[PDB]
Amino acid sequence: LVHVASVEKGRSYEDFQKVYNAIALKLREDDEYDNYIGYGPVLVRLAWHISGTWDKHDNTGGSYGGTYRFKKEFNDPSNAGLQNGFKFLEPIHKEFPWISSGDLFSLGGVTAVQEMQGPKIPWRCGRVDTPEDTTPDNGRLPDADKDAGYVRTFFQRLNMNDREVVALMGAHALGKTHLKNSGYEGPYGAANNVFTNEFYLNLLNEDWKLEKNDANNEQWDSKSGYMMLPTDYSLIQDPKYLSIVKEYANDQDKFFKDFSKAFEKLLEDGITFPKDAPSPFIFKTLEEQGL
Ligand code: HEM
Ligand SMILES: [Cl-]
């Protein structure tokens, strides 16, 4: 299975900046979503979910084909709640119908991060929509009621090492859990929508209490009102993970650099970029364009 990246016919950087801008402006506008959290978080999650289906063994799944658009993927239980990000993007696609789905779903995540004050994430276009037959079966996304070994093992399917995993998990500083979606609840709410190394600090500084929730699942609850899933908590239980955690808790810059690299990698897994492909683009935020 090879997936070669094919630039949307005749588009350039400028073309893509526009899609970005549209997503950005819309994020700014629809600030009421989820109790005023905005769509930032959910978009980040969607980008990760259409990408985390990848299997480095046979090259199946991954962001390339925009298969989330099909029923099977779309109705994946692990995807509960993503439907809101999709609906957010809909009108956007309608405006720029030439962009492929995989490119749009992924760009939304990049836009989200950057507009949430995260680091710049270089991005490459060229994902091509593939047929319904290429939709991976459900079951490839990770479970949350596990530990460090599970996490480690899981992520290896995606080619990510310890550092990548930890860097990537720091996205958990964002948004919140919704009982109806996953069987988890909180935080008690706050929720944040600014991208910082807060996840790490919370993990190291709070006094976590293990509790069972209304859905009968365990979660770590803090007095201050925060929450952490078992997989999240596991980062402090594993010796190797813990020191990285500590490192990020101490240096937001390091965190940002590493997150950027891992996120792009995650979004590019399984794709083959021809030699003549354009380099990755770094989009300007609204603010940088005075918009
Ligand atoms: C072991 C790995 C992971 C597990 C099991 C997992 C699980 C979860 C769960 C259960 C939710 C809450 C769903 C809800 O009820 O709406 C969630 C929230 C979300 N996750 Fe993850 N996640 C992990 C990795 C990721 C990574 C790698 C990212 C992206 C880099 C991500 C970003 C998010 C974001 C931004 C939210 C907040 C969504 C919102 O506010 O609607 N998580 N994650
Ligand atoms: Cl997630």
UniProtKB/Swiss-Prot annotation:
Cellular localization per UniProt: Mitochondrion matrix; Mitochondrion intermembrane space
Enzyme superclass (EC): oxidoreductase
Reactions mediated catalytically: 2 Fe(II)-[cytochrome c] + H2O2 + 2 H(+) = 2 Fe(III)-[cytochrome c] + 2 H2O
UniProt family annotation: Belongs to the peroxidase family. Cytochrome c peroxidase subfamily.
Keyword annotations: Heme, Hydrogen peroxide, Iron, Metal-binding, Mitochondrion, Organic radical, Oxidoreductase, Peroxidase, Phosphoprotein, Transit peptide
Residues annotated for heme b binding in this entry: 172
A Gene Ontology cellular-component term: mitochondrial intermembrane space
Entry-annotated residues carrying Phosphotyrosine: 150
SUBUNIT field: Forms a one-to-one complex with cytochrome c.
Organism listed in the record: Saccharomyces cerevisiae (strain ATCC 204508 / S288c)
Gene Ontology molecular functions: cytochrome-c peroxidase activity; heme binding; metal ion binding; peroxidase activity
Enzyme Commission number(s) of this protein: 1.11.1.5
Keyword Mitochondrion appears in the UniProt entry: yes
UniProt miscellaneous comment: Present with 6730 molecules/cell in log phase SD medium.
Chief localization: mitochondrion
Function: Destroys radicals which are normally produced within the cells and which are toxic to biological systems.
Cofactor(s) it depends on: heme b
Gene (UniProt): CCP1
Name this polypeptide is given: Cytochrome c peroxidase, mitochondrial
Catalytic site: 49 (proton acceptor), 188 (tryptophan radical intermediate)
